Every structure is written in structure tokens, then in C-alpha cells.
Amino acid sequence: YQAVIIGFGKAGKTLAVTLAKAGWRVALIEQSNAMYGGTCINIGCIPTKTLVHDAQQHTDFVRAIQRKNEVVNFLRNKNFHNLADMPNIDVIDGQAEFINNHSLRVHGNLEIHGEKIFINTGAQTVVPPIPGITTTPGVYDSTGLLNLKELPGHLGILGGGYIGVEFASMFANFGSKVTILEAASLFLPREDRDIADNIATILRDQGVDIILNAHVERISHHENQVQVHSEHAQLAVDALLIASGRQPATASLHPENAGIAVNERGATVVDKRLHTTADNIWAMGDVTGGLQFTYISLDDYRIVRDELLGEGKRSTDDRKNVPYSVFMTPPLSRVGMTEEQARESGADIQVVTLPVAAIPRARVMNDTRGVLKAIVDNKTQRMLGASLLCVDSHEMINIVKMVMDAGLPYSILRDQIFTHPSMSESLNDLFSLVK
Amino acid sequence: MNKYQAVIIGFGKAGKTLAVTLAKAGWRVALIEQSNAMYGGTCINIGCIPTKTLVHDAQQHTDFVRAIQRKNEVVNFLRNKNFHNLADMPNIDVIDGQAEFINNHSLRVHRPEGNLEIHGEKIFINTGAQTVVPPIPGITTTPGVYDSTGLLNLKELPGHLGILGGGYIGVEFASMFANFGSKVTILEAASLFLPREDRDIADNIATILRDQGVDIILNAHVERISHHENQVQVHSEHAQLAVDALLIASGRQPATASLHPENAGIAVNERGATVVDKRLHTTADNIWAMGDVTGGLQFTYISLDDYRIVRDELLGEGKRSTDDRKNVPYSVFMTPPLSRVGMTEEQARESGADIQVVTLPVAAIPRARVMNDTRGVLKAIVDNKTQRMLGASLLCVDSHEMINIVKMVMDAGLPYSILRDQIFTHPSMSESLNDLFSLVK
Ligand SMILES: Cc1cc2nc3c(=O)[nH]c(=O)nc-3n(C[C@H](O)[C@H](O)[C@H](O)COP(=O)(O)OP(=O)(O)OC[C@H]3O[C@@H](n4cnc5c(N)ncnc54)[C@H](O)[C@@H]3O)c2cc1C
Ligand SMILES: Cc1cc2nc3c(=O)[nH]c(=O)nc-3n(C[C@H](O)[C@H](O)[C@H](O)COP(=O)(O)OP(=O)(O)OC[C@H]3O[C@@H](n4cnc5c(N)ncnc54)[C@H](O)[C@@H]3O)c2cc1C
Ligand SMILES: [Cl-]
Numbered sequence: 001y002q003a004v005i006i007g008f009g010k011a012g013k014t015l016a017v018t019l020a021k022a023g024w025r026v027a028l029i030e031q032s033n034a035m036y037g038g039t040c041i042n043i044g045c046i047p048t049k050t051l052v053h054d055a056q057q058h059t060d061f062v063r064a065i066q067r068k069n070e071v072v073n074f075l076r077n078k079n080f081h082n083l084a085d086m087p088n089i090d091v092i093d094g095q096a097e098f099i100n101n102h103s104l105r106v107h108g109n110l111e112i113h114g115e116k117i118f119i120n121t122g123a124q125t126v127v128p129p130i131p132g133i134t135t136t137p138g139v140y141d142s143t144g145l146l147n148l149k150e151l152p153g154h155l156g157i158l159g160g161g162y163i164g165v166e167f168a169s170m171f172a173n174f175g176s177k178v179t180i181l182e183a184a185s186l187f188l189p190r191e192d193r194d195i196a197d198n199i200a201t202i203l204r205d206q207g208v209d210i211i212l213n214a215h216v217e218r219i220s221h222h223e224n225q226v227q228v229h230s231e232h233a234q235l236a237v238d239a240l241l242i243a244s245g246r247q248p249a250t251a252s253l254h255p256e257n258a259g260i261a262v263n264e265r266g267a268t269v270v271d272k273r274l275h276t277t278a279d280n281i282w283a284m285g286d287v288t289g290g291l292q293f294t295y296i297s298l299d300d301y302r303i304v305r306d307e308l309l310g311e312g313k314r315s316t317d318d319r320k321n322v323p324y325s326v327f328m329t330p331p332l333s334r335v336g337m338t339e340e341q342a343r344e345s346g347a348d349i350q351v352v353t354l355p356v357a358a359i360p361r362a363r364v365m366n367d368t369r370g371v372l373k374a375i376v377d378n379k380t381q382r383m384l385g386a387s388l389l390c391v392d393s394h395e396m397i398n399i400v401k402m403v404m405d406a407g408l409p410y411s412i413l414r415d416q417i418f419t420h421p422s423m424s425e426s427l428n429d430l431f432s433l434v435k
Numbered sequence: 436m437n438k439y440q441a442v443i444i445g446f447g448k449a450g451k452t453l454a455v456t457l458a459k460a461g462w463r464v465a466l467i468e469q470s471n472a473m474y475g476g477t478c479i480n481i482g483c484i485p486t487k488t489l490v491h492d493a494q495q496h497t498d499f500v501r502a503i504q505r506k507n508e509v510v511n512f513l514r515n516k517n518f519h520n521l522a523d524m525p526n527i528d529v530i531d532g533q534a535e536f537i538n539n540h541s542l543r544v545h546r547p548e549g550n551l552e553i554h555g556e557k558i559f560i561n562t563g564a565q566t567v568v569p570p571i572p573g574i575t576t577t578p579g580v581y582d583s584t585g586l587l588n589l590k591e592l593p594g595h596l597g598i599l600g601g602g603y604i605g606v607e608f609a610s611m612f613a614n615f616g617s618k619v620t621i622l623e624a625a626s627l628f629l630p631r632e633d634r635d636i637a638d639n640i641a642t643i644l645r646d647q648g649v650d651i652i653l654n655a656h657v658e659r660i661s662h663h664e665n666q667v668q669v670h671s672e673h674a675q676l677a678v679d680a681l682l683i684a685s686g687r688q689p690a691t692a693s694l695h696p697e698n699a700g701i702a703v704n705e706r707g708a709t710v711v712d713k714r715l716h717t718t719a720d721n722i723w724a725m726g727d728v729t730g731g732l733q734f735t736y737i738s739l740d741d742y743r744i745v746r747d748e749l750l751g752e753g754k755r756s757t758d759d760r761k762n763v764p765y766s767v768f769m770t771p772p773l774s775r776v777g778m779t780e781e782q783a784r785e786s787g788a789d790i791q792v793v794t795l796p797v798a799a800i801p802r803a804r805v806m807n808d809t810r811g812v813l814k815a816i817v818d819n820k821t822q823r824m825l826g827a828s829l830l831c832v833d834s835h836e837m838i839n840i841v842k843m844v845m846d847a848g849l850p851y852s853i854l855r856d857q858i859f860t861h862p863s864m865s866e867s868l869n870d871l872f873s874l875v876k
Contacts, residue, residue, distance in 0.1 A: 041801075045862050050805045057495065071804050294861040298869075302856060325860045333860060360479075363509050364487045395836040398865045402843060402857065415743065416843065419766045419774065419835045420735040421483045428739075 001027040001114045004104060006096050006253065009038045009120025010297035011284035013079065015304060020088040022309055027114070028083060029106050031095040031252075037079030039122055040294045043143050047072050048166060049327050051146070055173035056329045061151040064174075068146070098258040101278050116280055118304065119268065120297075121253060123246035123286035128158075132219030138226035139219065139240045142167075152176050152238035156228060158216065159243030160184055162326045165199070167241055169328035172206035179235060181214040181228070192338045195373065195387050199332060202369050248287040263289065272315035274303055291322060321404045325394040330370050333393035335401045336385025342375045349384065350376045352433040354426060356390050361421045365391050372426060374400070374410075376434050381409035392423045399424055410434055439465040441749075442542065442555035444534045444694070447476040448738040449725035449745070450561035451521060456746055458526035465553060466521060467544055469533040475517030477563050478735045481584050485510050486607060487768055489587070493614035494770050499592035502615075506587070536699040539719050559745070560701070560709055560717070560724040562694060564687035564733060569599070573660035579667040580660065580681050583608070589680070592617050597669060597678035599657070601628060603767045605684030606644070610769035613647040620676060621649060622669065624656045632773075633780045635794075636828050639812050640773060652676075689728040704730065713756035715744055731757070734765065762845045766835040771797075771811045774838035777826025777845060780816060789819035793874040797831045800867040808832045813871050815841075815851075822850035833864045840865055851875065 003019050005012040005028040016028045035042035047068050054064035083089050092112065097105035104112045125141045127133055140148065142163065155171050157164045160182025168178045180203075187210055188196040200210055218229040219240070228235040248267040255262055261277045262268050267289030274282050284300030286292055299319065306314050323335035342349045354372040362368045370389035377384050386400045403412055410431050418425035441457050443450040446468040454466045473480055485506050492502035522529040530553065533545040542558070544551045566582045574580050581589075583604060596612045598605045601623030613619045621644075628651050629637040641651055661668040666677040689708040696703055700719035702710045708730030715723050725741040727733045740760070747755045764776035783790050795813040803809045811830035818825060827841045844853050851872050859866035 040861075046801060046805065049862050053806055067807070075801060075804060295858045295866065299858055319858065322858055323860050325863075360484060360513060361487075363513065364484065365491055366505070392833060392836060394860045394863050395833055395865055398840055398857075398859055398863070399843065402840065402853075406847065406849070408847075412843075416839075416846075417736050417740055417760075417763065418839050419764050420478075421487055422835050422839070424836050424839045425736070 001025060001112060003027070003116050003118065004029065004112060004114030005118045005120060006104075007038070007120030007122060007285075008032075008036050008079070009122050009285045010040055010294050011301040011304070012118055012120030013038060013083070014298060014301040015118055015284070016083060016089055017086060018301075018305055019308070020086045023088075025088045027090050027092060027112060029092050029094065029096045029104070029112070033093040036076050036083075036091075038120070041075050041079055042072055043146070045294060045327075046075060047146050048142075048170075052166065052170050052327050052329065055170045058173060058175075061174045062149075065146075065148070095252055097252070098254045098256075098260070101258045101280065116282070116308075117258075117278075119250070119253070119281070119283045119287055120285050121249045121287055123292060124249045125242065126244055126247045127242050128244055130216055130219055133242070136219050136226065136240075137221050138238065139242070141242050145239070145241050148239065154179065154237040154239075156226070156235060156237035156240045157181060157243055158228075158240060159245070160187060160210075160212075161243050161245060162188075162324075163245075164241070164243030165203070166327050167243070168203060168208050169206070172203070172208050173329060177207050177209070178203075179209040179211065179237065181211050181216065181235075183214055185213055187212060191334075192340065192373065192387055195332070195371065195389060198369075198371050198389060199328070202328075202330075246286065246292060248289060250287055265289070272317055273307060273313055274300055274316070290316070291324075293322075293324065296322065321401050323397050323401045325397070327394070330367055330389060330391050331393050332370075332387070332389040333397040334385075334387050335397050336383065336404060337375060338385060338387070339373075339375065342377075342384055347377060347379055350378050350434055354430045354433065358429060359390065359423060359426045361423050361426070362391060364421060367391050372430050374427075374430055376410045376431070378434075381411060382407065383410050390423060390426075396424050396427075399427065436551070436553060437463075438554040438556060439463045439528070440555075441465070441557045441559065442467065442553060443559045443561055444542075445476070445561035445563060445726070446474055446517070447561040447563050447726045448478060448735050449742040450559060451476060451517060452739060452742045453559060453725075453745065454521050454527055455524065456742075457749070458521075458524045460750060462526065464526055465528045465530060465555065467530045467532065467534045467542075467553070469531070469545075471531060472514075474514045479513050479517055480510055481587070483735060484513060485587050486583075486611075490607070490611050490614075490768055490770065493611045496614065496616070499615050500590070503587075503589065533693060535693070536695050536701075539699050539722065556721060557749075558699075558722045560694070560696075560722065560728055561726045561738075562690045562728050564727040565690040566683070567686050567688050568683065569685050571657055571660060574683070577660050577662045577667055577681075579662060579679070580683065582683055586680070586682050593679035594618065595666070595677070595679045596620065597622060597667065597676065597681045598684050599669075599681060600684040600686075601625065601651075602684055602686065603765075604686075605682075606640075607768055608682055608684065609644060609649050610647070613644070613649050614770055619644075619647075619649040620652065620678065622652050622655050622657065622671075622676070624654075626654055628653060631779075632775070633814070633828060635780070636773070636812065636814065636830060639810075639830060640769070643771070643810050644769075687727070687733065689730060691728060706730065711757075713744075713758050714748055714754060715741055715757070732763065734763075737763070762842050764838045764842045766838065768835070771808055771830060771832045772834045773811075774829045774834035775827065776838050776842045777824065778816065779826060779828070780814070783816045783825050786825075788825075790825070791817050791819055791875050793817070793871060795867065795871045795874060799870070800831065800864065802862045802864050802867065803831060805862055806832050813867065815871055817851045817872070817875055822852065823848060824851050831864060837865050837868065840868065 003026040008030040050068045094107040154177045156179040220227045225236040268283040285297035325333040374386035413427040414431040440463040442465040535543040596619045598621040659670040667681040669676040702718045709724035711729040726738040767773040797811040798809045814828040816825040855872035
């Protein structure tokens with residue numbers, strides 16, 4: 001095996017198939033012999049957004065859980081066939097250890113060797129040191145909450161991140177009271193001045209309870225309900241989700257035996273081109289420690305592929321204007337800088353917003369909530385950011401990002417002919433407010 | 436009354452946008468609309484808004500009457516909204532009544548409570564199109580015959596719907612009432628279904644319609660429309676057909692016969708369309724024409740581009756024209772929608788260029804499995820000599836949003852690899868364009 005990929009991650013999934021067609025003889029290793037395709041397929045966005053779509057429709061929660069199951073099972077088998085149908089790939093099953101820079105121990109047991117090694121072990125949930133989180137019924141993480149038999153009446157969230165907002169909106173539409181608990185003073189502290197307030201009013205109208213400055217010190221199960229204690233105060237919920245955040249999973253590999261350095265939270269430090277301390281080993285995706293997304297992982301594969309099979313090289317520092325989306329209802333999609341970030345630099349700017357009641361396509365789809373906010377730099381007529389909170393905003397931001405990356409001025413989306421009726425054509429109105 | 440610096444005939448898209456634009460500059464604007472139920476124009480009351488609203492409810496399998504009631508309140512909101520966008524500015528006179536030309540300058544507005552006469556330094560024609568009624572005996576007398584207008588006000592869903600003709604507007608109602616739970620029968624008078632799209636595309640979309648119980652009878656021109664036994668009866672050269680409701684979907688041609696443009700010097704053609712410039716002038720001076728009356732594309736976005744052309748001339752930034760148009764996109768809002776831009780594979784194969792045709796089935800789009808609609812296709816055409824793309828055929832859910840990403844790369848002339856290497860948003864419909872252009876070999 002010249003190429004050995006540890007993990008069925010997005011970058012590794014794509015790297016293995018690409019190398020086999022280039023004449024390489026690849027072996028990918030994976031621990032979860034029942035959940036292929038990586039976290040994106042089984043645990044991540046695919047199962048989350050499959051239920052999110054069901055929630056907006058107000059469908060039975062249990063039947064929607066089964067519909068996720070057939071969807072996850074359909075894509076899991078396909079992801080395994082993409083790697084097994086290829087001849088030069090063997091999908092060995094089992095967890096992996098590092099014996100040496102070129103040798104791997106994998107679980108009865110196997111000794112697989114390789115000239116090149118590529119790690120895609122990803123990240124995993126990091127639950128805080130709270131007394132009671134160890135042994136308490138009703139406490140679930142992102143994985144365990146997706147397999148819930150019944151729909152709770154009151155679901156509490158431990159975290160105010162973007163993952164906690166997705167589940168808060170998801171269960172609110174299902175019919176459950178949701179309580180979000182983040183220890184911060186500001187809801188969504190990395191968001192704009194008024195965007196977070198708009199998201200707040202959208203959540204609170206659906207019964208969501210945003211508790212700020214919260215501190216949790218004990219978790220028990222008093223009389224059929226989970227208890228969240230906050231110094232002479234208790235919250236009774238039927239199920240508790242932890243939205244703590246994920247950190248790279250590079251502990252069961254023993255990276256010391258291969259001379260691979262990791263940082264303070266376990267992320268294998270990498271070169272601008274994803275080279276690690278070991279000269280012939282790469283690391284793509286969440287183990288890098290960069291943005292924790294499926295497209296950042298795929299773009300890591302494009303970086304390692306341009307090295308192995310391509311002329312010259314592209315690095316990670318050409319990654320400009322990386323977009324992200326919070327798949328609540330309606331979804332928030334962001335790219336570029338915020339209003340706080342735009343003014344933080346000594347370049348004057350223009351910021352006007354467009355209400356969603358002014359988009360006729362929003363009335364067609366029966367959801368007229370949110371705001372369309374974009375930032376234009378009057379010194380070069382270029383766009384420095386946009387925050388679109390409306391229907392299909394995840395589709396919309398791709399137009400906004402592609403124009404920024406090309407360096408084009410705002411006047412293109414102001415005069416471009418979009419289809420009708422659509423949400424992307426709102427940019428005709430959104431950028432006509434620029435003077 | 437006094438002379439107006441600009442008068443607009445019709446509450447259409449270009450006319451309504453121009454009225455608020457000229458009044459903002461201080462012009463004396465007058466917009467004449469012949470019906471109170473047409474404030475905001477065709478798109479608000481009869482076109483996109485009330486049709487797209489029922490398609491959204493149809494895809495969710497909502498009750499029919501519950502959707503019709505929701506449709507009415509959407510148009511009644513936006514209609515009242517569009518009346519007040521214009522009737523609230525002191526420089527806009529929202530005059531009701533049918534407008535008839537008397538001169539290059541004067542204009543008769545037919546008010547049933549006494550006629551009025553309005554003069555204008557500049558006149559802007561914008562009266563849109565009216566539905567074409569094919570010359571077939573029995574259409575205007577049989578009670579179960581509906582235009583696109585009268586079908587959107589139905590009381591409850593019919594058990595069998597008959598679409599007279601194909602076309603985009605025809606197929607639009609075919610997927611809506613079928614999804615509402617009703618057998619639909621599209622009777623196109625042609626040898627091929629959707630004759631101006633590719634066959635592979637047209638076959639896929641006929642399979643999506645047939646699986647919902649919609650039979651496409653071709654090579655059929657009707658002779659007599661009767662009402663034998665409680666159903667509209669349609670007579671052809673082969674087996675006759677019966678429907679609980681017949682929908683005519685033959686097209687719309689410009690409304691100009693009531694304007695009488697002969698008295699002002701404005702020229703018309705045989706179908707009745709105002710002859711226009713590249714800057715939308717007519718044969719008469721200080722008189723323009725905007726929208727479907729010009730005989731051009733009958734899209735709301737083209738009508739608004741018409742506004743950009745006349746706004747550039749009037750309010751002054753040099754001048755632009757209809758020659759600026761290229762790669763105009765369009766969508767056919769069925770379920771899933773068919774969005775198109777650029778050339779078809781036929782014209783590609785006919786051009787003789789060095790060409791690559793790439794195809795990605797929607798069943799390979801993970802976002803389609805998330806939205807529970809894996810039907811349709813994704814097709815594109817690139818040129819091997821220039822790395823540009825000639826056209827695109829996206830048949831999938833939310834294709835009306837991705838067709839704009841494609842059109843933006845084509846008008847900038849950037850190579851196909853722009854969409855191949857691009858950090859999209861996950862999970863989305865647009866990210867599967869990464870995998871569509873990775874197929875080029
Ligand atoms: C609830 C949730 C929602 C999310 N929503 C989104 C979203 O909307 N958008 C977005 O862009 N991202 C989202 N993500 C993140 C996304 O799932 C990942 O960031 C993305 O899949 C990156 O994966 P990766 O390339 O790092 O490899 P991963 O797919 O993370 O790799 C994990 C795989 O490697 C295997 N593995 C792990 N350790 C070992 C080992 N030692 N030996 C062998 N195999 C091993 C695991 O069994 C698993 O199959 C979400 C994540 C979660 C948990
Ligand atoms: C069923 C259907 C679906 C459609 N779907 C789409 C779609 O998905 N996308 C898209 O882009 N377009 C679509 N269209 C087309 C779009 O709705 C219109 O064609 C577009 O608004 C162009 O209108 P206009 O600007 O020319 O003026 P219009 O709004 O068409 O007409 C202007 C107004 O002038 C008035 N008028 C007429 N005669 C006179 C007179 N003598 N005096 C005074 N006033 C008069 C009429 O009341 C009319 O409302 C659709 C049309 C229909 C019928
Ligand atoms: Cl064209």
C-alpha cells in the first residue's frame with residue numbers, strides 16, 4: 001500500500017478514490033464497521049438536516065426519525081460501494097494505531113504498512129467536567145439525541161453555539177419546549193449586532209428559552225426528569241443535549257510512535273499544505289483544527305491532490321471568503337466580515353438592510369422572517385460581507401461569495417438578471433440601496 | 436388637468452418601477468391602470484405569485500381549498516402593498532380607467548363615470564399580454580373551459596384536468612394539480628413534447644409527470660369542444676376525451692388592440708406587438724414600450740431589465756440597450772423545477788465545436804435525499820477549446836437558485852473550473868456543482 005488513509009472522512013473518502021484511478025494501490029481504514037462515509041453521513045449534517053427539513057414541515061417526530069434511518073442507510077451503503085467497487089482499494093475494518101512512520105496496527109489484528117499515510121479521524125464531542133454528566137439518564141450528545149425513541153416535552157440545551165441553535169429550532173418545530181443555556185453574556189457572540197437579536201426573537205416565538213450568563217454545577221435525575229442545578233435553582237427537562245463543541249480525535253492513534261506532533265487540544269499541527277512533523281504523513285479535515293466543515297475537509301483533499309498528482313502547489317492560505325450556515329428555520333448563512341468587523345478597520349463602509357417582507361418569494365413559501373444584510377466598501381465598490389437570514393439563504397450566499405472571490409463590485413448583483421420568482425433575486429433590491 | 440412629464444399605461448413591472456423612480460427624481464408621473472384588481476401587475480395577481488404559491492402548497496400535499504384561500508390573501512396583501520408604493524408619493528397620480536390614444540401627446544382614459552383626457556411629455560406603453568384563444572368551435576360557450584386566470588380561482592379541485600397545449604405555462608399547471616391529487620391530461624398539438632429542449636431532458640420530465648398520472652397525448656389538434664355529459668368533451672382524430680375542467684394553455688400575445696396605437700403613430704406587427712428599438716423607443720417620438728407588449732420574452736425579469744434601459748436614457752448615465760442581453764436564464768416551476776441557461780445539447784452538437792457533455796443524476800446529490808426528491812437530472816455543456824460552458828440543464832429541487840450561479844460564470848466568461856473548485860455551503864443544492872464539472876474528461 002503506497003497510500004493509507006485513516007478514517008472514512010470527506011477528504012479521505014475523496015482522496016482514496018482519486019488515487020486508485022491514478023494507478024495508486026490504496027487502503028483506507030475505518031473503526032466504525034457499521035457507519036461508513038464519515039461523520040457527515042451518519043452523525044453529522046446529513047442526519048441533522050434530514051430531520052430539520054421534517055421539522056419545518058411539522059411532521060411526526062418518530063416517523064421522521066425512521067426517514068432519517070432509511071436516508072442514512074441509503075447513503076452509507078453507497079459510500080461503501082464507492083470504495084469497494086474500485087479494485088485498487090481495500091476497506092479494512094477496525095481501529096488503527098501507529099506503530100511507526102510507515103507502519104500501522106489495526107484491530108483479530110492486522111499489520112498494514114504504507115509509504116504515505118493520510119489521517120481523517122476527525123473530531124469528537126468534548127463534554128465539560130460537570131458533576132453528573134457521567135451517569136445520568138436523559139443526557140444525550142449530538143449522536144445520541146439523533147436516535148431518540150420518543151419526542152421530549154421539554155428539551156434543554158447545554159451550549160449556545162451554532163450546533164445548539166440548529167437543534168433548538170429543530171425540536172421547537174417538532175413541538176417541544178426548548179431551553180438554551182450558554183454561559184455567555186451575548187447570544188451568538190461571534191455574530192452581528194442585530195442579527196443575533198433577530199434570531200433570538202425567531203426562536204423565542206417558538207417557545208425557545210435563551211438563558212444567558214448561566215452556570216451549571218450538577219446534573220441529576222429527580223423524579224422522571226433531568227435536573228440542571230445553578231446554585232439553589234433547578235431546571236426540569238425530559239432530555240438534555242450537550243452542544244459543547246468538537247475537538248480532534250487523535251488519541252487512539254498514538255501519534256507519538258510516528259513522530260506526529262499535536263497541539264494542546266489534540267489537533268495535529270500541519271503545514272500550509274497539510275504536512276505534519278512526519279515528512280511522509282498528511283492530515284486533512286478536523287484533525288487539522290481548522291474550520292469544522294465538510295467543504296473545508298474536501299478542500300483539504302484538493303490541496304493534497306494538487307501535490308501528489310498536480311503541477312505546482314496550492315495551500316490553505318488561498319482560502320478566502322469561506323462561507324458558513326446555521327441550518328435553523330429560517331437558516332442563517334454568512335460570508336465575509338460582520339458589521340463589527342467591517343468598522344474594526346480604517347475603511348469607511350455602507351451597510352443597509354432589506355426586510356424579508358419585501359421579498360415576494362418569501363410570501364410564496366409561507367415564511368417571512370429574518371433580515372438580508374450586506375456590507376459594501378465604497379472605496380473600491382467591493383463587498384466585504386453579507387449576513388442572509390431567510391429562506392434558502394444557504395443557496396443564496398454562494399452567489400454572494402462567488403462575486404467577492406472574483407473581486408467584482410457590488411454593481412453586478414444590483415443589475416444582474418435573476419430568475420423569477422426567487423430568493424436570489426432579492427439581491428437586485430438588496431444592493432440597490434447602496435448610494 | 437395639467438400636462439404630465441411622464442405617463443405610464445399599465446401597472447406592470449417596468450411601469451411600476453419607473454413611476455417610483457421618476458417621482459423620486461421629481462418628475463410629474465402618471466400611471467394609468469384599467470382595473471383595481473390588477474394593481475401590481477400580472478405577476479402579482481394572475482402570474483407568478485398566485486401560481487407559485489399553489490405549487491408550494493401542492494408539493495406539500497395541502498388541501499386544495501385551503502391553498503386557494505392562502506393564495507388569495509397573498510395576492511391581496513401584495514396588491515394593496517403595490518398600490519401604496521405608488522399612490523403615497525405626491526408626484527404620482529394613480530389614475531384608474533382604460534387608456535386610449537388620441538394623439539402623440541393626448542390620451543383618453545375611459546372612466547365609466549365620465550371620460551378624462553391626460554396629456555404627457557413622455558408616454559410609456561406597458562400593457563402586457565392577454566391570453567390567446569385558439570380558433571376552435573365550442574370554447575367560448577362550454578362552461579367548463581378556463582384560462583390560466585379563471586383556473587386559479589376554482590372552488591375545489593377537479594377530478595380530471597385537461598391542458599390544451601404544452602409549453603412551460605402548460606406543464607406548470609400539469610404538475611401542480613397532479614400533486615394536488617388530480618389526473619391531468621396535457622394535449623399538446625406537436626410531434627415532440629417540449630420541442631425546444633433536449634430529448635434526454637424532455638424524457639426525464641415526461642417520466643416525472645407520468646408517474647403522477649399525467650398522460651402526454653401528442654400529434655393531437657382538437658376540432659370541437661362539447662359538454663356532452665357533465666364533463667367537457669374534447670374531440671380529435673383519435674379517441675375523444677372527457678374532463679371535469681379544461682385549461683387552455685396556448686400562449687399570450689401583446690394587448691394593443693384596445694390602446695389603438697394607430698392614432699399616435701406607434702407601429703404594431705401582425706401578432707400585435709409594439710415595434711421597439713434596442714432602447715425600447717417606438718416609431719413615435721417621446722413614446723416608449725416596456726414589457727410583453729414589445730413582443731419580447733415574457734418574463735418579469737426581462738420587463739425589469741426594460742426599465743433599466745429606459746431609466747438609463749431618462750435619468751442619464753449614457754445609454755444601454757437590449758443588445759446587452761446574453762445567456763438569459765429561465766425556469767419551469769414544476770416539481771422538480773427545470774432551470775435552463777445557455778444552449779441546448781442539440782445546438783451544441785449542431786455548432787460543430789469541440790464539446791463535452793457532462794451528466795450527474797440527482798440521486799447522487801446528497802441534498803436531494805435530505806429534501807426527499809431524488810428525481811431529475813443535471814446536465815451541462817463545456818467547450819474543450821475555451822474551457823467555457825455553452826449551456827446548462829438543471830432538473831432538480833431548487834434549480835431556480837443554482838441556475839443563477841451558472842449564469843454568473845457564463846457572463847463573466849470564466850472557465851468551467853471556477854465551479855469545479857469552489858467552497859460551497861454544505862449541505863446544499865449548489866455544492867453538487869462541484870461534482871458535476873469534475874466529470875469532464
Ligand atoms: C451534529 C453535527 C452537525 C454538523 N453539521 C454540519 C453542517 O451543517 N455543515 C458542515 O459543513 N459540517 C457540519 N458538521 C461537521 C461535519 O460532519 C464534519 O466537519 C466533516 O464531516 C469533516 O469530516 P472530516 O474530513 O474531518 O472526517 P470525519 O468524517 O470527521 O472522520 C470521522 C470518521 O473517521 C473514523 N475514525 C475516527 N477515528 C478513527 C481511528 N482512530 N481509526 C479509524 N477510523 C477512525 C470515524 O469512525 C468516522 O467514520 C456537523 C457535525 C455534527 C456532529
Ligand atoms: C400563468 C403565468 C405564469 C407566469 N410565470 C412567470 C414566471 O415564473 N416568471 C416570470 O418571469 N414571468 C412569469 N410570467 C410572466 C409575468 O407575470 C409577466 O409577463 C410580466 O409581469 C410582464 O408584465 P408587463 O411588465 O409587460 O406588464 P403586465 O403586468 O403584464 O401588464 C400591465 C398591466 O396593464 C394593464 N392594462 C392592459 N391594457 C391596458 C390599457 N388599455 N390601459 C391601461 N392599462 C392596461 C393590465 O391590467 C396589466 O395588468 C407568468 C405569466 C403567467 C400568465
Ligand atoms: Cl441567450
